[model samples]
Target chain A: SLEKHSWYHGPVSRNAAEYLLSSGINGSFLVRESESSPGQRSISLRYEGRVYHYRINTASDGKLYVSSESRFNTLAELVHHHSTVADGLITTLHYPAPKR
Target chain B: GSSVSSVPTKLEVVAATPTSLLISWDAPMSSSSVYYYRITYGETGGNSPVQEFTVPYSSSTATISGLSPGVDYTITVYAWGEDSAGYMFMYSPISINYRTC
Candidate 1:
């Protein structure tokens, strides 16, 4: 049986991760499993023909982390930093509702 | 005296693909006064290049292409007009989010 987990499932499965990426507002988001790193994932985004990739991993504690050259605590925080403070790019995410 | 207008309404992502998105909006309340429409979009947070498009006052839809697949984007639309006094007017911006297939 599948394990019951929190709203944010750590080590997000391939299907779930892809769904999450697809839920973005502006149709420029893509997500895929990492070939080089087992149990890791990668997210690629495009803007004006330039593509950028960000890597994701779930720590043993089940928290989400992102690597955009460095690391971030959450996807939200990473996007916020890149859009506002770091690179002036805008990123969006829509959290899914909890499955009762 | 002339005055600025309200933001566009019914802003939506009507269609999308891995490389493009089709968006539409309802004319502002002061539709007849509008001179042009402007659309801007970019990746949500990564310093992605922002792109802009201008449409004729008669049009209310635009297709934005050259987007990355599976990325998140913030899109905004503005209505520009001239108040009765011939002064320039810009409406509040209406924004939406979309993800490519």
Candidate 2:
């Protein structure tokens, strides 16, 4: 479960997640609850002073993906892949948002 | 809230060759409780290697190779998901046994 990961800020609002990433270096990122829908997810990554947000969509088959092409089995897999290769984000996920 | 009842069905196994076999099933109806599947296979007598892999909930088949000929083997498939509490777990599991040709 991604919840075990320090970077996974469950139920955190978009503004709250954005606030956390803004203080970190470029490519700092975190996963948080999406307000657009219940039980869904969104990614909040910081680059410079701007923060990018992307919703994690679940396919009809239950696969999770962000870029619409590469489907992952879990949030952990999505983070693992993006950590090494930005693929679609502004930059590679360089750091996880600092945890309390 | 999880849906443990959502697991692939119509389990079937076929010998692809004396050293390989194909296992298949129909994907269960789309359910949020099920994220993917974990498939495992091994010789019934414990050959020391329980070949294991996971497939997307959309998948319906898998193939296992390098098997010993004419040996009884068991293949198992499990529905997997993450609970609201951030714990990973298995829902329901189904299995079948077959003898290689």
TM-score of chain B of each: 0.84, 0.79
For candidate 2, write residues B1-101 as lDDT tens digits. 73445366678999999998888887676554555566777877554456566666677888888889999988887765545543234556788889887
- The top-ranked prediction according to TM-score is 2
- Scoring each candidate complex against the real one, what DockQ results? 0.01, 0.05
Per-residue alpha-carbon lDDT of candidate 1 for residues B12-60, written as tens digits (9 for 90 to 100)? 8944678888898986565457766768889887655667666766788
Off by over 4 Å in 2: B1-101
DockQ of prediction 1 = 0.01
Error of 2 at A71 (Å): 0.8
TM-score of chain B of 1: 0.84
Give interface RMSD (Å), model 2.
11.4
Quote the lDDT for B14 in model 1: 49
